[PDB]
Amino acid sequence: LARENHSEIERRRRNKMTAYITELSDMVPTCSALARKPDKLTILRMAVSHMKSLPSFLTDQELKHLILEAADGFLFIVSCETGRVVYVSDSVTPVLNQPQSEWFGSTLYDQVHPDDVDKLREQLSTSSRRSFICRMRCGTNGLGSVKEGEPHFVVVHCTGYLVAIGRLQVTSSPEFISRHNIEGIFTFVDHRCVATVGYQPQELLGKNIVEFCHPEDQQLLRDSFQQVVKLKGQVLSVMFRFRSKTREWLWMRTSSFTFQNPYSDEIEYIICTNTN
Amino acid sequence: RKEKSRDAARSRRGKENFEFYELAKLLPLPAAITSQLDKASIIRLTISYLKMRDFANQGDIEVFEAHLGSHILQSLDGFVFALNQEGKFLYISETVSIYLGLSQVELTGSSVFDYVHPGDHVEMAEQLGMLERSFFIRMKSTLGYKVIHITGRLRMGLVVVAHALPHMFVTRVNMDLNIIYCENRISDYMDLTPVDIVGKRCYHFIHAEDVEGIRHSHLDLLNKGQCVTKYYRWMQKNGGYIWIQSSATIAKNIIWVNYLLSNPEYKDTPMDIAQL
DNA sequence: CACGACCCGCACGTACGCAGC
DNA sequence: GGCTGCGTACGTGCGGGTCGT
């Protein structure tokens, strides 16, 4: 039971090994430009020759750039009492749009969001590792709809021991959306309605959507709502007339579905996406 | 006949072994482990080194610099690695040995699929195509799997920073995200106190444009045991919302670690009916 | 730190496939 | 076709490895 197991283990080792040999053959360009396949020995002599021709595997540059491509990460070092940025890597430029000179010498308190100073303060103290989340200024955003001509504060993830890598987590920063009960009562109205239908959100809340519907499409609205109740998580869209807060009938497509809890599977509400 | 074969073949094995161990000696690892090293792991490392340099150069005051590598690497709360168009680790920092117990020499060269939990294979083969990247997997931890969260970008080859899992407050909730327990400290940051949130579930409080994302995170939590949500908006009792990011685990009571991100934005207009 | 329990690596010896005076 | 330089593939035997009750 050990002779065959072992002869086949060794065969596996020969296929494997010679596969490393032939795989490395077309790596070192000496063997990939040559006419025919060389001697194994001479192959790996070429390999050590061309390998000698050149902190593990990667240089400081390649590991910096790899942190940057990886997750928008840049190194910085500040003081643990003052906040004086005594070092920053140049990766800050393709991360925040700050020149390296506006960041070197200044304070981290001065670079974060005014509200994000307290927590930042709670970082430069005592009474060892560190990791926190803080907004930072862009210059020349990732936390909410971009405001009208305001500065841009990203959400930087800071780790370190103060020596820190600050990395962006881009995959997290995200007509008008609403919620309803199974009777179609507005249980939520996103603010976009103000510019979408004109009302204020409280001016819809508590009320039924069929109230704002055209008397000729209301029955359709009810049958549809009952249907998305009866479709489970399946989506259903309907186009109807909506009486805005200015005396006008806007044609409005709204897709909606019921939100069934991923665990208990209960109806939380019905989500509407009301678009003109 | 064979005497010539005995000593001639022993000579060939001699030349062989000498080439192998000098090739090993030149590796970017210190003399300590590059000296006494496995014979096949030699060609693993060399192959992944040429593959990784090709990988890097085919794509787009004195102290804080001399230890650039160890500062970047030991500042991050995870390990950083680079794959290729096939899945082979073309690089991985030594620091992975901290969080998974895996040897850098052992992982450099092997297919990533070898060290990820099966059943989550086709997810990752999906994610490498087999431009941003962000997902949860399960990796062989020898300290029998860890929930590894990875973020990175895909260039033909992925590049990833990854971290492990076991101005903030903790909530205990059921599996359906029904708030069971809650710390008092929420009155620090939010309008309600641990009684007017307990009883109802998380979904009556998420901003209705995020409920999609939080739903997906609920799924991933459910199937893999751990999760981190995206930057979302938790509505306040009076109006608006505040930004939260939660590290959540199971095994069964969900614990929901809410990292605070911002103050109450847009506190006038009411969104939900729970704000009237 | 034992002990067969092995498993895995390693090299050894040899057997089969190709050049050529 | 003799037989030798030259090289890769096969199988097994040995010494250094890690578990387990």
Numbering used by the authors:
A (entry chain A): 89 to 142, 156 to 228, 259 to 271, 291 to 311, 337 to 349, 362 to 463
B (entry chain B): 59 to 118, 148 to 217, 264 to 276, 287 to 298, 314 to 324, 336 to 420, 429 to 453
The publication says:
One family of transcription factors in mammals is known as the bHLH-PAS family, which consists of sixteen members including NPAS1 and NPAS3. The mammalian bHLH-PAS transcription factors share a common protein architecture consisting of a conserved bHLH DNA-binding domain, tandem PAS domains (PAS-A and PAS-B), and a variable activation or repression domain. We employed the contiguous bHLH-PAS-A-PAS-B segments of NPAS1, NPAS3 and ARNT proteins for our crystallographic studies.
We could not obtain crystals of apo NPAS3-ARNT and instead pursued its DNA complex. The response element for NPAS1-ARNT is known to match the consensus hypoxia response element (HRE), but the response element for NPAS3-ARNT was not previously characterized. NPAS1 and NPAS3 closely share amino-acids within their bHLH domain (75% identity), including conservation of residues that recognize DNA base-pairs based on our observations of the HIF-2α-ARNT-DNA complex. We measured the dissociation constants (Kd) using a DNA duplex containing a central HRE sequence (5’-TACGTG-3’) and found similar Kd values of ~20 nM for both NPAS1-ARNT and NPAS3-ARNT. We then obtained crystals for NPAS3-ARNT bound to this HRE element and solved the structure at 4.2 Å resolution. The resolution made possible an architectural comparison, at the quaternary level, between the NPAS3-ARNT, NPAS1-ARNT, HIF-1α-ARNT and HIF-2α-ARNT heterodimers. All of these complexes share a similar overall architecture stabilized by the same six domain-domain junctions (see below). Furthermore, the cooperation between the two subunits of NPAS3-ARNT also creates a DNA-reading head that is similar to that of the HIF-α-ARNT-DNA complexes, allowing direct readout of the HRE site. Similarly positioned pockets are seen in the NPAS3 protein, measuring 100 Å3 and 230 Å3, respectively.
